[PDB]
Amino acid sequence: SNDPSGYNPAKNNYHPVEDACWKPGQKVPYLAVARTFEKIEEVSARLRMVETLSNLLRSVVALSPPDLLPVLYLSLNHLGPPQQGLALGVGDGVLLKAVAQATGRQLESVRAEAAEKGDVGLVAENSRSTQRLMLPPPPLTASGVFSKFRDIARLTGSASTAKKIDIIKGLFVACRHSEARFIARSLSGRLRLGLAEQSVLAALSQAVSLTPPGQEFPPAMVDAGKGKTAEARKTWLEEQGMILKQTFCEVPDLDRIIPVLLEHGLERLPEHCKLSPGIPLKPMLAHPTRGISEVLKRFEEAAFTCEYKYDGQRAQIHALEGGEVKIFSRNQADNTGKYPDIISRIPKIKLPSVTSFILDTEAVAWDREKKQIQPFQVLTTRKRKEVDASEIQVQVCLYAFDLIYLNGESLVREPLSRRRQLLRENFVETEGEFVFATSLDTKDIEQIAEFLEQSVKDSCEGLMVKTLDVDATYEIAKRSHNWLKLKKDYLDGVGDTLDLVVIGAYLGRGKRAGRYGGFLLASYDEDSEELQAICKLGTGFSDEELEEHHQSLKALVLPSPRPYVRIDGAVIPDHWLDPSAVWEVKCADLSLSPIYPAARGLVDSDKGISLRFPRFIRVREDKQPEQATTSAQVACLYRKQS
DNA sequence: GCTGATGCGTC
DNA sequence: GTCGGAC
DNA sequence: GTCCGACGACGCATCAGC
Ligand SMILES: *OP(=O)(O)OC[C@H]1O[C@@H](n2cnc3c(N)ncnc32)[C@H](O)[C@@H]1O
Ligand SMILES: [Mg+2]
Ligand SMILES: [Mg+2]
Ligand SMILES: [Mg+2]
Ligand SMILES: [Mg+2]
């Protein structure tokens, strides 16, 4: 109704009409979204973030229903449904170049300031635009910005980058107040509100519950909870929240959900949006566990099963009523074109009485000559888009462990004991092509230990543990991490541990802004008496330990690298460090690296060795660089993985 | 027609 | 993928 | 326990520059 600069979606007694900063039917100003982002990032309690976002959404619902879908995508920093594959194709380099041109500054200067500040958003908004005339263009709108993000993403092929930069410069030219900050963070893929998919869904269910869509204007019902006690209100909002969450888990597509929501309302939503083959769904996830004893603590007395945890890529296989077959990744991306070989074997895995299904499987590289699982790295050499069956060279075996839908029946609310039985009886195993995950039903600690040892001997990461009947459904909305993963490298006394030298530091971004966010590490090659970069490291240390690292490594900063340090193709550190600090580092496995020089020539002529899932464990004050893990030791640890 | 840098999606 | 912080 | 965003290696896919 006035100036969006003063918009406060965090105010007390927020009124969706009277406190909006735009008029009924008007397009939602982008500045309204930006001020909402400001108020969100100012707080740390999710519940406060959700109310703030809910207030904006209620104003959108009340005043400008068509902008709901854009505003939600801007809030998630998504371009659309994950199975459609839209991607910006920008990257820091392009974004920074656009900021340079827009502000008429040198690229190197913008790059150095972004790194120093740990944030592109502040650089893009604390500098004015040269192309801007005396008369600014019209103010940006939420849907307008979203459509421009989509335009950027749809630009492909030769000469597309320059067209992308033009759109980005136009946006920065039209920005006001804090707008440029959130445009830039969105384009860089680092919106970092502290609020994401789960909080957005909560704000959306809260908003449509309190301010129903479909009302004649002016809406008679602006706050549908005002007539309820505080406790009844909270119970009601939690129930409505679960209706939305469970539907979205089954159909994580806002293009489908939002129109239904505006037309029929939330309570009728499940009737219109149901789980079905051909629509990807959210997969069930797992929590790590320390050991067998913790497994018994979380599962108490409930019977459970242990399954090999195969080291491949999750594949959600959909067989539609009528024959069509789709395959999706754990992030709902369409991998159908990547697996022509699997699509052709579907008739061979399902009994003829199966008319439709959704299977939960692990695609694993398989050596047909040796009849043996192959490592995850081999699997990754497969082509991704538009693959022809004849050209496949790395074969895949599917390891199936769950069944989510069969013959028209959703199994989401059924216990695993029944889902597994339907999987085992209606599908056919073929060695090297499609098999059921090796499993063990027991409560005996001794058997479980031997079974965990055996899973590793059989080329697996460890064990997956799942209840059979108690809280054993596939309802992600109730618990997304219902399963437990047990790997050996989670244990304190098990796993490959290395002592590596810190040779560089990278300036932190976001939460790490103003300090180091990552470090470059090296092993010691005793033949050439050089330090060879082996991996980067950015997790495992607490906020306190990280502040100590910054204090302790600041005397070691060097203007130039030492001659006996070799990094080859690794990212050049922002700060070179005199080799001195030695840290203990844990990884899940060692891999052959196309960029790191550590141990190059000892296991492969061209490739050195790096670490899979590295994490900081502790400082090794009792170790000098000469006593750090050697490149020969690295090579020996890699060979031991057979 | 080719290549290095790098985006993007696996983990 | 692992991890720690805030709730 | 949930939710979130810091950060990791790696390989195919993509495109400015040649
Ligand atoms: O390490 P993480 O949390 O990503 O592990 C979960 C992934 O493990 C894969 N996987 C392999 N074998 C199984 C079984 N038997 N059951 C469940 N998941 C399994 C999946 O790809 C999963 O995302
Ligand atoms: Mg950097
Ligand atoms: Mg895995
Ligand atoms: Mg730690
Ligand atoms: Mg590129």
Residue numbers in the entry: 260 to 901
Question: Can you list sentences taken from the study reporting this PDB entry?
Answer:
Of the three human DNA ligases, LIG1 is established as the replicative ligase, completing ligation of the >50 million ligation events during DNA replication in addition to ligation events during DNA repair. Human DNA ligases utilize the energy of ATP and catalyze phosphodiester bond formation to seal breaks in the DNA backbone. X-ray crystal structures of the three human DNA ligases (LIG1, LIG3, and LIG4) in complex with DNA have revealed a conserved ligase three-domain core architecture that encircles the DNA nick, induces partial unwinding and alignment of the 3′- and 5′-DNA ends, and distorts the 3′-OH strand into a C3′-endo sugar conformation to adopt an A-form like geometry. Unexpectedly, we found a conserved Mg2+-binding site that forms a junction between DNA ligase domains and the 3′-strand of DNA.
To define the functional contribution of MgHiFi, we purified a double alanine mutant of LIG1 (LIG1E346A/E592A) that removes both of the protein ligands. As ablation of the MgHiFi site had significant impacts on substrate interactions, we examined the structural consequences of this mutation. Crystallographic isomorphism between the LIG1WT•DNA crystal structures enabled direct assessment of conformational changes in model-phased Fo (Mutant)-Fo (WT) electron density maps. Removal of the MgHiFi ligands led to the loss of bound metal ions at Sites 1 and 2 and concerted structural rearrangements of the DNA in the upstream (3′-OH side) of the bound nicked duplex. These rearrangements included 0.4–1.6 Å shifts of the upstream duplex, whereas the protein and downstream duplex remained largely static. The most significant motions are localized to 3′-terminal base pairs, -1 through -4, relative to the 3′-OH. Removal of MgHiFi causes rearrangements in protein–DNA van der Waals contacts proximal to the mutation, creating a cavity that allows for alternative conformations of the DNA backbone and dynamic binding of the phosphodiester backbone between the -1 and -2 nucleotides. Overall, mutation of the MgHiFi site has localized impacts on the trajectory of the upstream strand. Our X-ray structures of the E346 A/E592A mutant reveal a cavity that facilitates dynamic protein–DNA binding in the mutant ligase structure. We hypothesize that the impaired fidelity of the LIG1E346A/E592A enzyme results from relaxation of the strict geometric requirements for Mg2+ metal coordination during DNA binding, and creation of this cavity.
